[PDB]
């Protein structure tokens, strides 16, 4: 069975400290505080730090990742209507899939909107906002 | 626990009344279904503190009622009648699913897809949706 069904831990990363990067003579980008206007599409997939003010906080919501099904015909557990397991696939009769929330993988989810600070906005524009997803503990 | 309590009540009627020969006012109790509802769980952490790991675990809350829906009838037993020979079945619900017969159950009448659902001869159960703040 997939390892993620039993992992009780969550992984997080914190960025390089500017003092350490300067000490080791490297140009750290991860810890640089960025406004949503400076956040272009080129930085998609990069590890960045966003500086701003929180405007909206979504409440805690469950978030499914792998839906677990059970088949009474063969007893196998299928992880994502009709059972696709090896026994049912070879057999002429296939069992019906029933969802099992207990074995399904769930995570705590919230969404928050960040907005630019006043000094970050050039004259004549409107303070844009960006969406932040928070997962795990 | 509820199934245990139902069996316990059945045992209580059998053991404490008729086995004790006190009386026999239990004939219908063998058939009726019971349920025991726990209420005084220790004080809980409130709605805003709940977490995904708390799913399926009994908790306690307080709040205020805002909106109440009317008594929605939920299906428990389905009533089917054959559209060519007028035979009547009684199909119960197993885990929230309705199994529609594909053929009439009578030996003489075997027409496929000959069964029809009669809405108003079914048996329903009361469902009420309440909103709490
Ligand atoms: Zn199967
Ligand atoms: Zn018939």
Swiss-Prot record, chain A:
It comes from the Eukaryota. It is found in: Cytoplasm; Nucleus. Belongs to the MCM family. Present with 166 molecules/cell in log phase SD medium. Early fractionation of eukaryotic MCM proteins yielded a variety of dimeric, trimeric and tetrameric complexes with unclear biological significance. Specifically a MCM467 subcomplex is shown to have in vitro helicase activity which is inhibited by the MCM2 subunit. The MCM2-7 hexamer is the proposed physiological active complex. Acts as a component of the MCM2-7 complex (MCM complex) which is the putative replicative helicase essential for 'once per cell cycle' DNA replication initiation and elongation in eukaryotic cells. Core component of CDC45-MCM-GINS (CMG) helicase, the molecular machine that unwinds template DNA during replication, and around which the replisome is built. Component of the MCM2-7 complex. The complex forms a toroidal hexameric ring with the proposed subunit order MCM2-MCM6-MCM4-MCM7-MCM3-MCM5; loaded onto DNA, forms a head-head double hexamer. Interacts with CSM1 and MCM10. This is DNA replication licensing factor MCM7. The gene is MCM7. The chain holds residues 192 to 338 of 845 of the full protein.
Curated annotation (Swiss-Prot), chain B:
Present with 8800 molecules/cell in log phase SD medium. It is found in: Nucleus. This is DNA replication licensing factor MCM4. It comes from the Eukaryota. Component of the MCM2-7 complex. The complex forms a toroidal hexameric ring with the proposed subunit order MCM2-MCM6-MCM4-MCM7-MCM3-MCM5; loaded onto DNA, forms a head-head double hexamer. Acts as a component of the MCM2-7 complex (MCM complex) which is the putative replicative helicase essential for 'once per cell cycle' DNA replication initiation and elongation in eukaryotic cells. The active ATPase sites in the MCM2-7 ring are formed through the interaction surfaces of two neighboring subunits such that a critical structure of a conserved arginine finger motif is provided in trans relative to the ATP-binding site of the Walker A box of the adjacent subunit. The six ATPase active sites, however, are likely to contribute differentially to the complex helicase activity. The chain holds residues 268 to 400 of 933 of the full protein. Belongs to the MCM family. It comes from Saccharomyces cerevisiae (strain ATCC 204508 / S288c).
